[PDB]
Design an enzyme around this catalytic site. Structure first.
Site, mmCIF file in Angstrom:
data_model
loop_
_atom_site.group_PDB
_atom_site.id
_atom_site.type_symbol
_atom_site.label_atom_id
_atom_site.label_comp_id
_atom_site.label_asym_id
_atom_site.label_seq_id
_atom_site.Cartn_x
_atom_site.Cartn_y
_atom_site.Cartn_z
ATOM 1 N N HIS A 71 0.849 -1.210 0.000
ATOM 2 C CA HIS A 71 0.000 0.000 0.000
ATOM 3 C C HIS A 71 0.873 1.244 0.000
ATOM 4 C CE1 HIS A 71 -2.969 -2.947 1.204
ATOM 5 N NE2 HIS A 71 -2.396 -3.115 2.383
ATOM 6 N N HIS B 191 2.113 9.067 1.060
ATOM 7 C CA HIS B 191 1.024 8.813 0.118
ATOM 8 C C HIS B 191 1.382 9.761 -1.019
ATOM 9 C CE1 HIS B 191 -1.562 6.817 3.125
ATOM 10 N NE2 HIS B 191 -0.887 7.600 3.949
ATOM 11 N N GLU C 234 -3.312 13.422 0.986
ATOM 12 C CA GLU C 234 -4.599 12.992 1.524
ATOM 13 C C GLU C 234 -5.319 14.236 2.027
ATOM 14 O OE1 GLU C 234 -3.609 9.374 4.019
ATOM 15 O OE2 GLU C 234 -4.550 8.612 2.224
ATOM 16 N N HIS D 239 3.535 10.910 6.592
ATOM 17 C CA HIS D 239 2.881 10.646 7.867
ATOM 18 C C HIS D 239 3.865 10.001 8.809
ATOM 19 C CE1 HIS D 239 -1.286 10.439 5.786
ATOM 20 N NE2 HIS D 239 -0.913 11.674 6.069
ATOM 21 N N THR E 255 -6.244 6.470 7.645
ATOM 22 C CA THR E 255 -6.734 6.765 6.298
ATOM 23 C C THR E 255 -6.756 5.542 5.396
ATOM 24 O OG1 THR E 255 -4.590 7.433 5.415
ATOM 25 C CG2 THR E 255 -5.974 9.188 6.405
ATOM 26 N N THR E 256 -6.416 4.375 5.961
ATOM 27 C CA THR E 256 -6.550 3.098 5.244
ATOM 28 C C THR E 256 -7.251 2.146 6.215
ATOM 29 O OG1 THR E 256 -4.254 2.557 5.928
ATOM 30 C CG2 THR E 256 -4.609 3.153 3.649
HETATM 31 O O1 S8A Z 1 -1.691 6.548 7.268
HETATM 32 C C1 S8A Z 1 -1.526 6.902 8.425
HETATM 33 O O2 S8A Z 1 -0.838 7.928 8.793
HETATM 34 C C2 S8A Z 1 -2.084 6.215 9.621
HETATM 35 N N1 S8A Z 1 -2.247 4.786 9.450
HETATM 36 C C3 S8A Z 1 -3.328 4.108 8.899
HETATM 37 O O3 S8A Z 1 -4.242 4.651 8.365
HETATM 38 C C4 S8A Z 1 -3.096 2.666 9.085
HETATM 39 C C5 S8A Z 1 -3.942 1.642 8.675
HETATM 40 C C6 S8A Z 1 -3.586 0.347 8.996
HETATM 41 C C7 S8A Z 1 -2.431 0.084 9.704
HETATM 42 C C8 S8A Z 1 -1.566 1.074 10.097
HETATM 43 C C9 S8A Z 1 -1.928 2.374 9.762
HETATM 44 S S1 S8A Z 1 -1.048 3.831 10.099
HETATM 45 O O4 S8A Z 1 -0.929 4.093 11.488
HETATM 46 O O5 S8A Z 1 0.133 3.965 9.340
HETATM 47 ZN ZN ZN Z 2 -0.578 7.580 5.973
#
Ligand code: S8A
Ligand code: ZN
Length: 257
Positions: free
Chosen positions: A61, A93, A103, A116, A195-196
């Site tokens: 991802h 991202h 995002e 992030h 965000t995922t």
């Molecule tokens: O994208 C982000 O900043 C926050 N995250 C997420 O959205 C996410 C989703 C699944 C596992 C781990 C994470 S994360 O903490 O990296």
């Molecule tokens: Zn992120």
């Protein structure tokens, strides 16, 4: 499973993760004319001098630069936060074109990418328990614009050749995340979510106002990664961002006037 393609992308996530249509989903558009300055917000405290990076992983991802979070070596505190949050990993991202990729957006403006830096609240003991709490995570978001190269990002760009596909990892020690920060720590903050998937509403978002600049060559290399695993049809890892979600009953606060 879920992804960013037309048949398994953000518009489909709610079928397996109903919280996708929740009350505090992220990212969101940051309207600079309605965010309110909050004089009671404290300066952010980013203490990364003892940070210990360990590995970089392509998880299908994005790619995560992982840190040793078994001790208070790299922590975020202050700002809108109560307590101490330990850095567990950072990732980005990005888009297929320089005009998209972030995002969060600022007055609907999309940046080429968004960094992030993910931290979890030490009062919950581990990341897995923290994501089950409303104040479990603190994510520091930093926008990337294309222009001059960011020297501190180059070590990351150069190792990407070795983790081209899903599941690949590589040793990544002695990386200093301080080299990814802009000069100012002025920020906007609001309560949100991952965000995922699983899209859990466990994040205090802290988004820096000042973007960092990266070169076109640097972002171009991010776009050479693959969502797929080795030996599978090549699907370039681009546009791995979720679009802005409804703000609903939330206020974005600014740390600066
Ligand atoms: O994208 C982000 O900043 C926050 N995250 C997420 O959205 C996410 C989703 C699944 C596992 C781990 C994470 S994360 O903490 O990296
Ligand atoms: Zn992120």
């Amino acid at each position: 499973h879920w992804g960013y393609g037309k048949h398994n992308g953000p518009e489909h996530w709610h079928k397996d993760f109903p919280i996708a249509k929740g009350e505090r989903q992220s990212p969101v558009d940051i309207d600079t004319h309605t965010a309110k300055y909050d004089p009671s917000l404290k300066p952010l405290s980013v203490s990364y001098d003892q940070a210990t990076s360990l590995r970089i992983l392509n998880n299908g991802h994005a790619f995560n630069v992982e840190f040793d979070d078994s001790q208070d070596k790299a922590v975020l505190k202050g700002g809108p936060l109560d307590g101490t949050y330990r850095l567990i990993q950072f990732h980005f991202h990005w888009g297929s074109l320089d005009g998209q990729g972030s995002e969060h957006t600022v007055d609907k403006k999309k940046y080429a990418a968004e960094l992030h830096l993910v931290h979890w609240n030490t009062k919950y003991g581990d990341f897995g328990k923290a994501v089950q709490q409303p104040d479990g995570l603190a994510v520091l978001g930093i926008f990337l614009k294309v222009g001059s190269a960011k020297p501190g990002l180059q070590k990351v760009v150069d190792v990407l050749d070795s983790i081209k596909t899903k599941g690949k990892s590589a040793d990544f020690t002695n990386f200093d995340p301080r080299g990814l920060l802009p000069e100012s720590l002025d920020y906007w903050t609001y309560p949100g979510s991952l965000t995922t998937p699983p899209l859990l509403e466990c994040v205090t978002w802290i988004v820096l106002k000042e973007p960092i600049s990266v070169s076109s060559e640097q972002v171009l290399k991010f776009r050479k990664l693959n969502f797929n695993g080795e030996g599978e049809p090549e699907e370039l890892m681009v546009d791995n961002w979720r679009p802005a979600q409804p703000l609903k009953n939330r206020q974005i606060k600014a740390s600066f006037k």
